[PDB]
Write a protein that binds this ligand. Structure first.
Ligand SMILES: [Ca+2]
Ligand SMILES: [Cu+2]
Ligand SMILES: [Cu+2]
Ligand SMILES: [Cu+2]
Length: 463
């Protein structure tokens, strides 16, 4: 197996700047070359390293031949630098943003947010990571050797055509159920191996799929100890044997590594339309962990951080967000899925403006409301009325889940999150926006099943 590719850990240079170049290149998958897009390279991107309380300026050079944007997913930053669909970078052009990091340590990420084309641009290869550090986390003595015992794991599926090229399409079927493929990539590689020292191995997991939810486990059922979610550390580790991860979510886990026993990280079949078609009808390897018989230094702390109480709900503004899909899209898309793949597509269970929030397909020129600045609000998001999975992402914040799809959140999902599951039921989150977003650079709230976002399931809001 190839070694697990490790994204470069990109820190500020001598001028306090970071340079990112967006461009087209080539990669090889299964011995066949494909055109791919990357940040500072051919595919995917680096891990931008930030410190809480320190400003960095990022210079972003778009060397593609089409318009793009760069969204810092999970970052609590003003709308002007949030990189939603209004954050246009012309082809051949450059935009610079200053990030004033004002949140605790976390693994965030970055990716395009081009109006109507986010799915395609992510599918072509664009995604990178953000590693935010603070004083608190560094005192913990967690595994911290990047690319050795502290490793990012960006898991993505792709569909390829017979010629080896990426086969992306936004059509009636994918507008309904998402773009998904039969090939799983781990930091861009097919089933790579990672050599890790004996002791604890820290994995920063990102589901970077357009539409496919994942469920991580190990091949011998050794536990995963969840230490962090989208917005940073949990108060204490949460031991799990399976870890569902929705599109765009991150979790950091520690797993034990010992000398005479290699094992795989795997993903288990999920109950989501289209996602259990072979080879995903069975557990699927993600990467092989190869023990190297030298002792690692990292620890699993009993206590990771302090998690504040949920604030009082009394008197908070409640905003209702009803997700919906045009019944015609729902029917036609499901029918196309069934016709192509048959019953296995349901195991365990103009389209361009057919997905909606509050009866409205995304209109970039009309923010749906103004949210308060510096005040907790209660947002209620419903997927009642269809059977699709909607991981709902709200920009400009890290929130607390009060209820997730009609149930209290699982312990490892009860900390800081920027995504919440919505699937045929109702979720409620406690959100606060500390930064401005004017109408010209509004925050987005949207489904992170990218083809839903691209066909209308998004709203803009100002702060
Ligand atoms: Ca202990
Ligand atoms: Cu995102
Ligand atoms: Cu959706
Ligand atoms: Cu977004």
């Amino acid at each position: 197996r190839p070694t697990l590719p490790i994204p470069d850990l990109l820190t500020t240079d001598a001028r306090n700047r970071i340079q990112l170049t967006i461009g087209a290149g080539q990669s090889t998958f299964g011995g066949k070359t494909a055109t791919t897009w990357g940040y500072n390279g051919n595919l995917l991107g680096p891990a931008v390293k930030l410190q809480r309380g320190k400003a960095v300026t990022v210079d972003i050079y778009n060397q593609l031949t089409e318009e793009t944007t760069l969204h810092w997913h999970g970052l609590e930053v003003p709308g002007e630098v949030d990189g939603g669909p209004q954050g246009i970078i012309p082809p051949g052009g450059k935009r610079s943003v200053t990030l004033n990091v004002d949140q605790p340590a976390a693994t965030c990420w970055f990716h395009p947010h081009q109006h109507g084309k986010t799915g395609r641009q992510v599918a072509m290869g664009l995604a990178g990571l953000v590693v935010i550090e603070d004083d608190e986390i560094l005192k913990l003595m967690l595994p911290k050797q990047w690319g050795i015992d502290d490793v990012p794991v960006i898991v993505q599926d792709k569909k390829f055509s017979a010629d080896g090229q990426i086969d992306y399409q936004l059509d009636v079927m994918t507008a309904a159920v998402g773009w998904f493929g039969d090939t799983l990539l781990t930091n861009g590689a097919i089933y790579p191996q990672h050599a890790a020292p004996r002791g604890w191995l820290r994995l920063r997991l990102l589901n970077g799929c357009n539409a496919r939810s994942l469920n991580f486990a190990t091949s011998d059922n050794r536990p995963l100890y969840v230490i962090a979610s989208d917005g940073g550390l949990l108060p204490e580790p949460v031991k799990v044997s399976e870890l569902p991860v929705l599109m765009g979510e991150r979790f950091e886990v520690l797993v034990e590594v010992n000398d005479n026993k290699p094992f795989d990280l795997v993903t288990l079949p999920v109950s989501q339309m289209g996602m259990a078609i072979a080879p995903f009808d069975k557990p699927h390897p993600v990467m092989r962990i190869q023990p190297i018989a030298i002792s690692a230094s990292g620890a699993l702390p009993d206590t990771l951080s302090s998690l504040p109480a949920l604030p009082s709900l009394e008197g908070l503004t409640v905003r209702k967000l009803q997700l919906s899909m045009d019944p015609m899209l729902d029917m036609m898309g499901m029918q196309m899925l069934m016709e192509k793949y048959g019953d296995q597509a349901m195991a365990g269970m103009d389209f361009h403006h057919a997905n909606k929030i509050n009866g409205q397909a995304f209109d970039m020129n009309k923010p749906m409301f103004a949210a308060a600045k510096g005040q907790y609000e209660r947002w209620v998001i419903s997927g009642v009325g269809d059977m699709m999975l909607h991981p709902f992402h709200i920009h400009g914040t890290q929130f607390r889940i009060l209820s997730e799809n009609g149930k209290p959140p699982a312990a490892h999902r009860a900390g800081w999150k920027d995504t919440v599951k919505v699937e045929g039921n109702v979720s409620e989150v406690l959100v606060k926006f500390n930064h401005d977003a004017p109408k010209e650079h509004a925050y987005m709230a949207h489904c992170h099943l990218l083809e839903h976002e691209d066909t209308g399931m998004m709203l803009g809001f100002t702060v």
